[PDB]
Write a protein that binds this ligand. Sequence first.
Ligand SMILES: *C/C=C(C)/C=C/C=C(C)/C=C/C1=C(C)CCCC1(C)C
Ligand SMILES: *C/C=C(C)/C=C/C=C(C)/C=C/C1=C(C)CCCC1(C)C
Ligand SMILES: *C/C=C(C)/C=C/C=C(C)/C=C/C1=C(C)CCCC1(C)C
Ligand SMILES: *C/C=C(C)/C=C/C=C(C)/C=C/C1=C(C)CCCC1(C)C
Ligand SMILES: *C/C=C(C)/C=C/C=C(C)/C=C/C1=C(C)CCCC1(C)C
Lengths: 221, 230, 232, 228, 226
Amino acid sequence: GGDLDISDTVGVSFWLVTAGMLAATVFFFVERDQVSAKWKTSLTVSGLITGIAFWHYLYMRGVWIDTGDTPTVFRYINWLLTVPLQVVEFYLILASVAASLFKKLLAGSLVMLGAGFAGEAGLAPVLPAFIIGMAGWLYMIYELYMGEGSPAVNSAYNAMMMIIVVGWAIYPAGYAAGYLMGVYASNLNLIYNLADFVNKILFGLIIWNVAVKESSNALEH
Amino acid sequence: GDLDISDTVGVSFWLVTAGMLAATVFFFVERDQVSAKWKTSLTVSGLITGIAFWHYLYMRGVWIDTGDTPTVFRYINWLLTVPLQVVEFYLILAACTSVAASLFKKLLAGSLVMLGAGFAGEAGLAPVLPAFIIGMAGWLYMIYELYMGEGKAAVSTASPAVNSAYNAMMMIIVVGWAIYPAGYAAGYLMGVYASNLNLIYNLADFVNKILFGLIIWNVAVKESSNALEH
Amino acid sequence: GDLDISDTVGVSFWLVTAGMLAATVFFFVERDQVSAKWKTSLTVSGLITGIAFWHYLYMRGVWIDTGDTPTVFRYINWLLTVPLQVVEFYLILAACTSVAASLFKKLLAGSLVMLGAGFAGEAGLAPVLPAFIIGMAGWLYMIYELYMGEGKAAVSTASPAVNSAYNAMMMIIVVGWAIYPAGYAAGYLMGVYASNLNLIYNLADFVNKILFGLIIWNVAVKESSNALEHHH
Amino acid sequence: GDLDISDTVGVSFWLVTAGMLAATVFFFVERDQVSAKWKTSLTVSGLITGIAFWHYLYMRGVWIDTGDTPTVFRYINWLLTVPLQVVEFYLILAACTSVAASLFKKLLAGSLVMLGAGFAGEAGLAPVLPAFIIGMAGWLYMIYELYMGEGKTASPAVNSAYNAMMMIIVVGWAIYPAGYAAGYLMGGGVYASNLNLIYNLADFVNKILFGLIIWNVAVKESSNALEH
Amino acid sequence: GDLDISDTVGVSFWLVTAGMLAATVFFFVERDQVSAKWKTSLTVSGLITGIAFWHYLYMRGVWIDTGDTPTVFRYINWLLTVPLQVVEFYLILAACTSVAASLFKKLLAGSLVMLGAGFAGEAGLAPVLPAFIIGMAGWLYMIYELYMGEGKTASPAVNSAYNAMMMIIVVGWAIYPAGYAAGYLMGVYASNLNLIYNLADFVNKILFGLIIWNVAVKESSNALEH
Ligand SMILES: *C/C=C(C)/C=C/C=C(C)/C=C/C1=C(C)CCCC1(C)C
Ligand SMILES: *C/C=C(C)/C=C/C=C(C)/C=C/C1=C(C)CCCC1(C)C
Ligand SMILES: *C/C=C(C)/C=C/C=C(C)/C=C/C1=C(C)CCCC1(C)C
Ligand SMILES: *C/C=C(C)/C=C/C=C(C)/C=C/C1=C(C)CCCC1(C)C
Ligand SMILES: *C/C=C(C)/C=C/C=C(C)/C=C/C1=C(C)CCCC1(C)C
């Protein structure tokens, strides 16, 4: 019944990103009619990612406010549901040898989240778990750069390259800051929240920008 | 607060509820990536996943409040969605043989018996093994009538798309649907293993409601896009 | 807790609540499969199931919380929805005759006499038998106008597809609708059996509101399809 | 608990609430049945009816809960919807007269005097007779400006929509001051039942039915203009 | 109970909440009344009012359970909304200059200094006058960059939407500092503050969003004769 606790920096970013995702989810669904059939399914999936995110952010934030405990299970369940979706996006803008890419990328992301989970969950020591984490991460990055092998599809893929490399780096940076020093619960949750924001929203926005440029270029011809 | 990952059925319920909700949204929104011929399939898919969603919230509620198996919601959900899947089957069958309406009635009859028997088992309104067998009768009657009884009238190869669909519906009613009796056996024919029951029931709905849905959407999008040259 | 299987009236309420939800969605979405001629009819069918949904939620609430028959919720729900079905005749007949509004008025007055007499009986405002009779009178006056009165005049000047719609709709009011007075009869004219009464009413609501919508859906999807072919 | 049929007013709220819900969906969904000329006006018809729905839920809570007139919810709802109604009036004048801009401003001025007055009367901030009389003055001021003053047609739909407007702001709108008379100016305790039953009728007529008329006109012009 | 009318700001919150509910609906629904060209602009417009709506609902529970100014919910709304308003300024700006992305960043920094200052004052994190001066400075730095800095015209709809931006950020936004002045710089006057912030949200989100709607439907209708 009161105002937000400004002293609760973690409750505030939980709030902001909740909203971020809801705005996002709406933006992506409604803007579908400013891209052609070529791009529309991409946009749907962007919306599902941000929308599924939104519901768990609701649920995570309440867990903070009622207990101040880190919502690890809610956080990885969210990632378990959205990462594959982000990876389907890759397959989707390639549909070459794209179904093998999909299967490899998926298995490696499931490894990255299983490793990471086991650590935060106390099912494995914290540093080895991180390493297997990175293994599956870097294994994904490897198959994009080294593995395989229109101008719109290019600028679309390139941006995906960057986000998996540069963007995604915030998450293992978050895991590190929380568990790999001196648990640093606040720092973790801020970096994860910050990571979810950049990666689920900016990713969807890049697709959108490309889709709209292209849908517009094609509409004169 | 946090999900209790020790609650494996707990988690499974959460995952599938999300999948049904996401899939529901995906079937409805994507109606516009397919032609008039396919849109109603998308609607029915979305409806099937929609009803599942609301019943999955309820089913999780009971599992978590009490740790009992939500048999009634489970079977109520099936009662509502199985007929609609059978309708999806009829839609496909109407494209490729002039015997589709008769079949719809038989499938429906099969499906009601399958479910009524199964329910008797779990509700303890009849012994588990006879009930299973009777239910299996219903299931197989459907498979029979579809491929060896009246369904013995010709398929049509005319449309490669409708072939794809026809093949999917087969895979699902033969292979797909087989996951549910697996669940029942595992829960009731060993020596009640509540977890295994629900874990497998939950995987089956995922496969049979979402994955079936997606295969139809794929075929639908592919045929709709090809058509757009001609 | 799990739905109580042993409360079968409760389960029927759940089932129809869901059916109503589902059909509501189905009619609204499916409007993009019909031409401008039929779209509003599907908007109206959607509203019927939509109002029914909301009202089925309170009706169920009531039964499960107290065990009483939601008689006012029921009649109020029918009062809001019956006139929208009747509008449906006006909608599909408005272009091809001027008597559409005359008919409509007649059908409505029939429908209100029918509903009012039923309520009176079930609410204890009149004996159950006399109410049932005046109720039936109302119902039968609707069927008269539909078969051999103003409704017969108005449908002659009409296309095949509007004819297939009209007749299908009329037949649902002859045979489909009979489940309702049957339910009343089951409840109030025997040696009150609330269980049989809410069971049959539930069944009646399920069948009639969905099927009426599906008929209009079916004709329209067919006429609309045919119309895009014979103009291309 | 089943609805209480003896609560006439509480049944009245239930029904109208339900009508507003229905109507909001109707007007929004139906926009694809009208041409660009008419869509926004259907949108405004959904907003009025949508905003009325939410307030009717609240209005009925208050009645069921306390048995008292929900005056503030009533006038707040009217505060939000009446300018929207006056917006729909302006759009119609936009196609007709050549000075819709000024009329709108004047019509908006009347409506606010009207509601202000009405509210003072009911909230007990002013005697109920002068309150009524000032209220009436505002209303009549709007009517004057439409028929005799600054409001003094080359299309059949604009002709129907303009006339629809000219009729409703008199015969339709007249139900409200009637209901206020009924409630405060007959046996001066207050007659809450009559007051609320009559407003509930008036919101019904003026939000839903008048909305159905614009829909009807629009669905006709659009389909006719669809050839050629 | 009936809504409490003695509580003026109480019903001010009620009214504006509702305006945002309605305007959100207006702007999405009316997208089919404008061309691709304007569609995104309206989306950003409903987003602004949608977020606001959800925040006002919360703001109003706070005023009512406690009678306290909901400073946190308010500035949290602005943090979400203002950047979104600045992206609408960028789309308008891209159409009438080569320099629009450099402007988006300067205006966004401008706007965050504007908001953090104000918050610091209201939150009690910093004396109320020097935060006001710093906050003004972020605003005026935006106005500087637009008028007489790196902002120095195409079709008549682009010029309309341009001019609306140039007016709102001067006269429209001005209503916000006026409220803070009214509340913290006179002798905390919490009613006038909240009444004026409510009016400012109404003008700059609903009214300004409405101006853009207007430009877009006309231009969308004109261009349609070809
Ligand atoms: C929508 C969420 C996304 C795209 C999440 C991506 C998360 C990662 C790439 C996490 C990576 C991690 C490591 C590479 C090492 C340790 C465990 C992590 C999970 C946090
Ligand atoms: C959406 C739900 C669907 C398509 C469910 C299908 C369920 C079955 C095919 C269940 C079959 C069963 C048997 C064949 C044996 C006895 C009872 C069963 C229900 C588990
Ligand atoms: C959507 C609901 C509908 C169309 C309900 C229709 C109900 C009737 C036609 C009821 C008829 C009755 C009689 C003819 C006898 C008196 C009692 C009845 C009301 C249930
Ligand atoms: C959607 C509601 C509308 C368009 C309501 C209109 C209400 C009025 C025009 C009420 C008028 C009254 C007077 C003219 C006399 C004083 C009392 C009244 C306010 C109720
Ligand atoms: C949707 C909300 C908007 C556009 C809010 C804008 C708010 C401002 C421009 C506030 C400005 C202020 C100053 C310029 C001085 C410092 C204190 C203020 C923050 C309230």
